[PDB]
Structures are given as structure tokens and as C-alpha cells.
Amino acid sequence: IVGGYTCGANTVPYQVSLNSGYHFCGGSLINSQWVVSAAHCYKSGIQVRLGEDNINVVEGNEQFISASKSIVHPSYNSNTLNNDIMLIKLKSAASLNSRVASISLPTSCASAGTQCLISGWGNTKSSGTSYPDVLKCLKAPILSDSSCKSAYPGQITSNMFCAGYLEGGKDSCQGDSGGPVVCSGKLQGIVSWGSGCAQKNKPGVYTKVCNYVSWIKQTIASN
Ligand SMILES: COc1ccc(O)c(-c2nc3cc(C(N)=[NH2+])ccc3[nH]2)c1
Ligand SMILES: [Ca+2]
Secondary structure, X not given: OEOOEEOOOXXXXXEEEEEOOOXXXXXXXXXXXXXXXXXXXXXXXXXXXXXXXXXXXXOOOOEEEEEEEXXXXXXXXXXXOEOOOEEEEEOOOOOOOOOOOOOEXXXXXXXXXXXXXXXXXXXXXXXXXXXXXXXXXXXXXXOOHHHHHHHOOOOOOOOEEEEOOOOOOOEOOOOOOOOEEEEXXXXXXXXXXXXXXXXXXXXXXXXXXXXXXHHHHHHHHOO
């Protein structure tokens, strides 16, 4: 997260760290046994880490659960990143409390101008790598589709939305992928891609979760 602030331990209780021996992606807890992340975060050997704050120290509140299966969206395209969403089922259910809680799925999509909270342990520099130990937060607004499409002409599908600052300086970055974009208490986006990080006129692009709620519910209902 570039230009963000320290969230504070356990203030984002649905945030998970996808770990394969190091933090590689973010994710969101949607019920005690399922996590939602981005399809480009897929790999086998995924341990889901809940209740985290400093990902390098065990401080208490952490629950490490192995993924029983990951379900990448069948229409995911790794060249365009269209349908960049993945569901991970956990081997065992997490104990939900105040530090580990699920986030609700939206009933409607969000509008441009909606302010959302993006969080993650991804890079904090737009030039070079500085990964933090604790979770960073950034409040960013969803942008209008016309500004999004003028920024990435021909690269935005109806399953993507832009959120961020066109003047540059604040954005999500590498390491943040798969994590949550929460607006008004509802999961509206999944960190997906961007051109560099916090560069002017290059806002972050996110998976538009409101287009997948029936797919998520139908898939969880059958697995
Ligand atoms: C270069 O290697 C990788 C590998 C996986 C990623 O998700 C990313 C990545 N770049 C990203 C850029 C952004 C952004 N909003 N500017 C957000 C997530 C990203 N994730 C980069
Ligand atoms: Ca920790």
C-alpha cells in the first residue's frame, strides 16, 4: 500500500494473509470456512493466516489454517485478468471472534465517489521495494468508468473498476493483490492490478465482486 497508514492490530478483522512460506497475497474471510482472493494469487501449498497484524512475529490472535481447495473462476483469463477471483475453502473452520470476523458480500454494486478501505502488507514505495511488517490501510474512492477507461483504454472489462488517486502518491501495490476493497461494510473489490504503483493517471484496478455474488453463493453451496 503506498501512501497509506498503519491500520492498527486487528482493526481489519476479515483481512487474511495467503502464505506459502512468505506473505504472497491478501484475501478476505467471508464465512468461517471460505476466503475470497484474486485468481492470479493461486498456487498450491497455501496456508491462510487469520488475525494477523505483524506477519513476521506471532503476537497472539493468529489462526493458521491450510486451504483444503482453491476454486479459480472458470472464466479467469490470465492475460487480461478478467474474472480475477478465487474462493479458498479452509481445512477447518476459523474461530470467529472480534479479531477474526467475516465481511459481508454486497447486495448492490458501489457507485463512483464511494470511499473504500483497501488494506494489505504489499509494497509501500512506488519506486523500489519496502514491505511492511504490519497491515497498512488506505482510504480510496471508486472512480467513474470514464476516468478508468481513459486511464487503461481497451483494458477494462465490466468486471473491473478503478479506485485511487489520479495525482499519484497513494495506491495498493505488489503484495496487496487478492485483498479487500471494503465500502460501507461490504466487500466490493479485490485488489487485482495497476501500471506500477501510485503513478499519476494510473489508478489501481479491482475485481468487481458485485458481479460474482451468485457465483460465490452457488459455488460455496455445492462444495
Ligand atoms: C510484478 O509482479 C506482481 C505479481 C503479482 C501482483 O499481484 C502484482 C501486482 N502489481 C500490482 C499493482 C497494483 C496497483 N494498484 N498499482 C495493485 C496490485 C498489484 N499486484 C505484481
Ligand atoms: Ca503475527
